[PDB]
Amino acid sequence: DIQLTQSPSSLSASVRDRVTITCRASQSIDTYLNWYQQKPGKAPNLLIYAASSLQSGVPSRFSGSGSGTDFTLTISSLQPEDFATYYCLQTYSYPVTFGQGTKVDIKRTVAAPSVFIFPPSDEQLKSGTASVVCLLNNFYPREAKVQWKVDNALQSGNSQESVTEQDSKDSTYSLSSTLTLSKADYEKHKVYACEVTHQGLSSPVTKSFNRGE
Amino acid sequence: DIQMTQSPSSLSASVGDRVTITCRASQSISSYLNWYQQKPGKAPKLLIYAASSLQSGVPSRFSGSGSGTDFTLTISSLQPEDFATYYCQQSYSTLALTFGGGTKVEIKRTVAAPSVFIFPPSDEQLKSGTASVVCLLNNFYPREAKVQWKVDNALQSGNSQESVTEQDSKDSTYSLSSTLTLSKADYEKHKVYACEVTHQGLSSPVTKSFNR
Amino acid sequence: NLCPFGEVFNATRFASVYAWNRKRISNCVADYSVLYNSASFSTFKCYGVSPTKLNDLCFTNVYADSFVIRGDEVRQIAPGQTGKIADYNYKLPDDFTGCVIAWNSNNLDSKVGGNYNYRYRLFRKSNLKPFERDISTEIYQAGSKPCNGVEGFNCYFPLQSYGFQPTNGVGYQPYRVVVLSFELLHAPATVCGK
Amino acid sequence: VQLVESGGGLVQPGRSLRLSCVASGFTFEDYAMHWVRQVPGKGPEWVSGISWNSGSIGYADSVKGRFTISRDNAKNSLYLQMSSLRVEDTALYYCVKDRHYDSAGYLVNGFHIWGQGTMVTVSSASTKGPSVFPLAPSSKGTAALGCLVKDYFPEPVTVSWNSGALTSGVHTFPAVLQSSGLYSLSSVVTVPSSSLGTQTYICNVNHKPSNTKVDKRVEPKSC
Amino acid sequence: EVQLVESGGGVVQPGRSLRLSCAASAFTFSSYDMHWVRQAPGKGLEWVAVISYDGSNKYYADSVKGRFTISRDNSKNTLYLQMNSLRAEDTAVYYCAKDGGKLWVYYFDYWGQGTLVTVSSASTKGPSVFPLAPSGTAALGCLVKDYFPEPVTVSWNSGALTSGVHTFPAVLQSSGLYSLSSVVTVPSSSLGTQTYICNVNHKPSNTKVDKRVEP
């Protein structure tokens, strides 16, 4: 009922940088706002309570400020272990509502993905279903679009995507998209391609194959 | 706070008399009550602590008694150096220590009528813009005396200041001076300037006045 | 070992004044100097004993009473006081020996929608005796007709909520109070200051 | 100091589950208690909370009327009765200790201690083993190949390469919940092109919920 | 034999600050609690603050809390009172008092001579002396008006005329200054033959005025 909007939704900064995250409430909430740090696969840890009060054991490089509707979370000097998603949480009224979160990532240089395509096996085609897979290997930033083309027809509502967590070494991401069709629907078409658009690509890269070659 | 009320506020006794001063408390203070003597222009000195314990070096003619809300200090035989103001102070509320109003023990002499003199403002003062009318009560006893300013039979309230001297070393009498201060514009607005004196030694109120 | 004063002052919540909590402190060494200079206190008044002298005295038992009232009522937590709190909720004797400590708890005990969890006894036929704790919720009979446990005309619930909101004046804000009582029996003492 | 959840598991949609939380290491009566859930791969959603003396109870709009929170102070326990479980309710449910005692407007109200969470999986179907199909390296310096683990339930699966001898360049992606209620997952690896005719590449798929193990050899497709 | 000597008193404008001292002697200063007690002009005694023997605990009266600060230096055997944000209500003679220490409660057994603190914005102005001419003996005197601050010494015939003189305590009029009256009763026969001159001296302003008094 009270909406919390964080900006940005994703952030890229290097170690020693000053990180500032914004959280805006749809209506005045006084100082009733908390900040949480959540690493993936872990419970959210409280960082700031009462808008600006530091939680016990939280490093002083974290600090919060603001009152009313506009608030800011600040990491004075970014650290390697501070990669996580940061949520703001209003405790002014019920229901308890969270922000959408700001994923803080350690900045790397822009990196282009390597694209591979795989046809469905003869073994699966006898099973009645055909699955075409597309691979995006080692790219940065995470924002990347995968477009499925079946005989140059854009496929929506029959494919699903999955993105890896950012690699701890080269700080890149990886994505896999899977196009699913029945055997009868598969033998109806020939060309299967996947188009990839990314910041590290001056133009979209497309990998394709022809059925039965 | 705990209010300490002493009775009487003033008493008159001669050397050798037995003087008893009363000190009442707004609430029970057990036995935490102290007595202090203060000479004019001097630091207070402790006489009794814990209601009844005599301080070291204080003459045994001083003694205290009482508990709860009512307390008494007693000087069995008043001496010439004992004429001073006596304060009681409660110590039950250790972080809100409060004193009594004080009881000034004075020298009883025979009743003396005051000599009343009035002085108009000098010519050297009227040119500055202020006019002060002065009334004098000279050598009277006791101290209780009322000075009422009447300007054209109108009682002047909120416009005079009083001052009383200490007891004279010769005749043990008091002296009072009242100064009525008004601007020059208020001065030529009226005609009659009088000073009314009420005192125990006067069978009727005496008034000394002059015409401008 | 040390006396647990931190468990009373630093408790995450406090009791309502009608159901005031009491902590009996015995067989321990008390550090009063660190306790009294820990947090900032808006009210600090001692009776019958100095707060700097406690480090030298010994007592059979020390009682730490704690509760929550509003700002205008802290003055009632004192010997010889009268009022709704002093008569019907928490009463100190006229010869009380100890200290009463209070601090503003608006950040802890006030709610946006109002904190109605803190209560106080509003109706009682007779006054509480010193150190009396009445937690009864019996319907108060204000007239000649019996109530029989049913609220109505001349039949009032004896407890009343405070309703703490952080924007209220300081007189209406919640204040946490701690009353330290120092009992001296003719028995071997167990609490000495150090 | 700990919060231990139990009661989660597999449940069919429209049925009910009762979650429990055993608290220790602190005064359970001294703090409000809350339930927060997190769908795999998504953010957090607060579910329900309770004051302490049952003086205040709240629910998220998406669960109000269907969930009932309660606490047994004598047993240091928090409960969540989840009647009529929709699929949108599938998530890991965290038992969480609140900083103070209000569930509305305390500046201090926070989620200071979190349990490990119990998993509530709401979906149709029972256990099914996955099929493993090769993602063969194509002909068109470094080449990539992989394996597809399709149509299994419930989670999870694990995939290795060359029995663990091949780890550099391996990416295994989180699984997606298909519309059929079954999961699917992929794993890939990049290798030098010069070894595609001399080095054999085999993926090792393991789906314990169905006792399925499959060793698929991934060869370049012959014309 | 217990001595306490104060210093640091004087004039101060409202809102300013002033620091007082209290040097102790001939007793164990680092073992007794110490007090400050003030006394307004013509009023009673008011306890101000207390400090422990070691100076770790400090307690103040509500009239000065959050405004005054008590402190002590056991190496110098001195007691301090930092008075900030001084109002007109603080105008009083300030005493330091040693704690008796024989009870569970506080009580003062020895007092210092005291130092005056006058809170007022009025500049040190010289007095204006005006005569009082007489109209069965007679009386005459002088009017020392409009001077700041206390005190002023008034004598007659350079101290030769002692009997019959009455100098009254000063009064603080609404103009922030002081007014004082001094009279003397003389026989009416030596009026034009005996000349009367009042000697007024104001050390704070360095003003000495001699004025003749004739009917």
Residue numbers in the entry:
A (entry chain D): 1 to 213
B (entry chain N): 1 to 212
C (entry chain Y): 334 to 527
D (entry chain C): 2 to 141, 146 to 228
E (entry chain M): 1 to 135, 142 to 221
List passages from the publication reporting this PDB structure.
The spike protein (S) mediates cell entry by binding the angiotensin-converting enzyme 2 (ACE2) cellular receptor, and many neutralizing antibodies bind S.4,5,6,7 Mutations in S can therefore impart two important selective advantages: firstly, mutations to the ACE2-binding surface in the receptor-binding domain (RBD) can increase affinity for ACE2, potentially increasing viral transmissibility. In this report, we generate a panel of 25 potent mAbs (IC50 < 100 ng/mL) from vaccinees suffering breakthrough Omicron BA.2 infections. We have determined structures for complexes of four of these antibodies by X-ray crystallography and cryoelectron microscopy (cryo-EM) analysis. The BA.2 mAbs segregate into 3 adjacent clusters, two of which (left shoulder and neck in our anatomical definition of RBD topology) are hotspots for the binding of potent mAbs against early-pandemic virus, while the third cluster, which we term the right chest, spans between the neck and right flank epitopes in early-pandemic responses (note that in the early responses, right flank binders were not found to be potent [IC50 > 100 ng/mL]).
BA.2-10 (IGHV3-9) binds at the right chest region of the RBD as expected from the competition mapping. It makes extensive interactions via complementarity-determining regions (CDRs) H3, L3, and L1 with residue V445 of the RBD and with R346 via CDRs H1 and H2, explaining its reduced neutralization of variants containing the R346T mutation (e.g., BA.4.6 and BA.2.75.2) and complete knockout by the BJ.1 variant, which contains both the R346T and V445P mutations. Activity of all mAbs was knocked out by one or more variants including Ly-CoV1404, which was inactive on BJ.1 and XBB probably due largely to the V445P mutation. There is a third more extensive binding patch at the front of the RBD, the right chest, which spans between the right flank and neck regions identified in the early-pandemic responses, extending down almost as far as the S309 therapeutic antibody on the right flank. In contrast to the potent BA.2 chest binders identified here, the early-pandemic right flank antibodies, which bind nearby, were generally weakly neutralizing.
